[PDB]
Each structure stands twice: as structure tokens, then as C-alpha cells.
């Protein structure tokens, strides 16, 4: 069976199954899943470009920009001009956004701890290191 060991299919199924478990949580706290991805990606970060935000949130850039339009209207994020290149817009979370997402982030950490507990610390750290190295080799 081709699909049983094919890496992209394994990554996509593991990602969908683990993420879908947290969806209910995010929505019960009043967040859409994409709002959660944006605010969790910006929490504790210096301002990043729209393109960087689109990559880390695995969301298409036009979709990200419409999302930021409403999140900025609600005071949860802010878009800012870039240092030199003004082809580039930066984005950051505001204090209001951080306060809105902090509890959900603790719940996310607890859920992640549960997902990783059966694997033990060595296998969990190996998995995270491999995924980080793959991202850094394939990001454009």
C-alpha cells in the first residue's frame, strides 16, 4: 500500500488529526481557527511581514490580509510600515490581542503535552527537531 508509508500523507494526516482536536477549544473561547493561528503566531514576536505570517499560519496571503483587516478593526493586531522596503508591511499582536489569547495558549500547551507524553522526551524532541529542520530547508 503506497499511502501507508508515504511521508507527505503521514505528515498531513498527523497534522489534521492533532490540530482538529484543538479546534473545539478555540471556538469555545470565541476564536475562529484562523484567528487562533494568527494570534498564536504573533504572541511574543517582534513585527513580521505579511508573507512570513502567511507562511507560519499556512494561510494564503490574500486570505491573511482580509483576516487582518477585521482583526485590526477589533484592535487585536496592528499593521506597520517596514524599516526601508515599503513593498513590505509588518504586523504585530497588540496588548489586547495578547490578553485575549493567553489562556487559550496555556490550553494549547497542555494539549500538546498530552499528545507528546506517550512518546517520551527523547522522541518528542527528535520529532520537533526534524520538523524544524525540514521547515528551514523547504521554506521559500
Ligand X SMILES: O=C(O)CCCc1c[nH]c2ccccc12
Binding partner of 5, given ligand X, a copy of itself, none, CB within 5-8 angstroms per partner class: a copy of itself
From the CB of residue 97, how many other CB atoms can be counted at a distance below 10 Å?
22
What's the order of all strands across the beta sheet hosting 77-81? 48-49, 89-93, 77-81
User: Which of residues 43, 50, 56, 116 is near ligand X by CB under 6 A?
Assistant: 56
User: Which of residues 25, 34, 43, 94 is near a copy of itself by CB under 8 A?
Assistant: 43
Residue tagged 517582534 (cell numbers): 46
Tell me: is residue 113 an annotated ligand-binding position.
Answer: no
How far apart are CB 20 and ligand X at their closest, in Å?
A: 6
Angle (nearest 5°) at CA 30 between 29 and 35: 105
Residue tagged 500500500 (cell numbers): 1
Residue 9 near ligand X by CB under 6 A: yes
**Given the rule CB under 6 A, which residues bind ligand X?**
3, 6, 8-9, 12, 19, 23, 33, 37, 40-41, 56-58
Amino acid at each position: 500500500r503506497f499511502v501507508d508509508d508515504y511521508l507527505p500523507a503521514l505528515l498531513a494526516q498527523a497534522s489534521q488529526l492533532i490540530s482538529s482536536e484543538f479546534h473545539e477549544v478555540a471556538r469555545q473561547h470565541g476564536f475562529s481557527v484562523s484567528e487562533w493561528r494568527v494570534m498564536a503566531s504573533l504572541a511574543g514576536s517582534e513585527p513580521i511581514s505579511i508573507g512570513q505570517l502567511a507562511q507560519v499560519t499556512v494561510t494564503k496571503q490574500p486570505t491573511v490580509t482580509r483576516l487582518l483587516d477585521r482583526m485590526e478593526a477589533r484592535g487585536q493586531v496592528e499593521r506597520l510600515p517596514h524599516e526601508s522596503d515599503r513593498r513590505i508591511t509588518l504586523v504585530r499582536i497588540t496588548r489586547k490581542g495578547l490578553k485575549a489569547v493567553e489562556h487559550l495558549m496555556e490550553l494549547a500547551r497542555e494539549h500538546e503535552r498530552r499528545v507528546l507524553e506517550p512518546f517520551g522526551l527523547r522522541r518528542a524532541e527528535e520529532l520537533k527537531q526534524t520538523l524544524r529542520q525540514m521547515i528551514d530547508l523547504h521554506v521559500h
